[PDB]
Amino acid sequence: GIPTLDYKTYTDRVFFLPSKDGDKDVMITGKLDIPESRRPIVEQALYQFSNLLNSKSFLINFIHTLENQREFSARAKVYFASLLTVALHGKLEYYTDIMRTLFLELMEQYVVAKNPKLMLRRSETVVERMLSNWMSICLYQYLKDSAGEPLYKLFKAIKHQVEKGPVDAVQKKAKYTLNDTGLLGDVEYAPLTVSVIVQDIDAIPVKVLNCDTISQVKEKIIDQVYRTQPCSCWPKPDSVVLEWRPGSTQILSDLDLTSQREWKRINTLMHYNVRDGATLILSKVRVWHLVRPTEIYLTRLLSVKGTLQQFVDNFFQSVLAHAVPPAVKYFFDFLDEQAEKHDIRDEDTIHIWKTNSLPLRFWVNILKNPHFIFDVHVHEVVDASLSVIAQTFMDACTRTPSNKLLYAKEISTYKKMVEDYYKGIRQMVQVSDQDMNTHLAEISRAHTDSLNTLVALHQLYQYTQKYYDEIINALEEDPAAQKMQLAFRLQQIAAALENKVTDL
């Protein structure tokens, strides 16, 4: 029933969609371009690059060396970590091992720093994004079970209240939203119902608005015509035609000779004299819309809040109450033991730690980006409202504005849920290292082969390529890495995988 994305699609969207070279960069594309006269050797060396990444000393020196360099954007941190997640999917126990190491080191560097309650709040390191990906991985099957339900319901609800009212195409401001900044200030309209005919031939009724742009109207139709079909296969409103046949003839285009200018106005349904019950035809073949560049705001925000309150609530009651996932239990108890070993007395430091670890690092990301798990494409208008809910959700975990005004008693109510949630996890039966390693093992066995391993490996290789000297030297400094001669191995691997070649 609930349109949950495949594992690979889910992971790719979660990891690489907000990365450096865009939404279709290298890895979602698998855009590895090498000559086939080099593929044997290239692969042969990439495997040894894998075995190299499986050496602990090499991986740790690699990571430290990279963290050292100033020229290393936040993008670089996140992306790199995600690559490391994909390339080490094979032995996730080893991954978890690395994460344990870097997390211990980060913890100990934070305790005797300035503020240990600031830990996992900067996202300025690799192991934080690693942990993020770890939570994402282990909770896939939890999302596909109970989590996805009220979340999909929430999304679709918000989307409904949004499309129920007018939305401006230019500024992306809607009459119905939770965002005060993305709220539309008062144009008359009407909930129109039009008849659309699809030729591939079938007739389908569609609910729209007369003030909607032609593009928007097309979106609203396509949304109904291709429901059964995944979003990737849907056509854009710029590769589909919309006609109106009154008697025996006019084509509908956002901007045309009939556009009203004075500045150009995007054409709407009430512009083409198109009233309710009309019949349209869908064949697969500056500028202002509504606004020419308070208590009403409070009222609209509150009514919208009242409508979505049920779904927000259901979501939180499933999220913050139930059988808590094993990785959550394991990691929170790990935070417990490592907080006992690191002498941090304050309980709110551990509450802040667990907060930074699970709800912020995982739940908020999904709440703001539903299209990472569901076969949906979301516009800025809905994502903004979901972001308001995400702010609201985060304030329910902080032991300390429109998101502050909107949900008042809510946050207080949910704080009890959060504290009792953490307590429930603490008073929960211990998941040993073995059980956890097993649960990781089933994931590793189930999903590595569908993952884009070679591209990951190659990207990471490019990271070693950029900082070759600092890394080789980092390996020559460390006695274990010069014992294993990891520098020589890295040198050979680099030797094989090169681009520009000349025979002398």
């Binding site: 020589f488 040198q491 680099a494 030797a495 000349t502 025979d503």
Partner: protein, 75 residues
């Protein structure tokens, strides 16, 4: 870091240069004049001029702009 000298043969020098910023060695002909140099050697000096900041074209030019080449690798 080692210093080696090789003369041309009836089948050329006997090795293959790869890389751009970090120019190094890929394969050596198993019967050339280098095999009888190791596989995987970074060239840091060529023909007097250090190739630390040299381009691929520059290293190739340096090695090729002369009868015999004498270079300093890093193994």
């Amino acid at each position: 870091q080692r210093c080696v000298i090789i003369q041309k043969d009836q089948h050329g020098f006997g090795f293959t240069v790869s890389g751009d910023r970090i120019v190094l060695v890929q394969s050596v002909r198993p019967g050339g004049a280098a095999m009888k140099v190791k596989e995987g050697d970074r060239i840091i000096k060529v023909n007097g001029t250090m190739v630390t900041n040299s381009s691929h074209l520059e290293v190739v030019k340096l090695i090729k702009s002369g009868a015999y080449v004498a270079l300093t690798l890093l193994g």
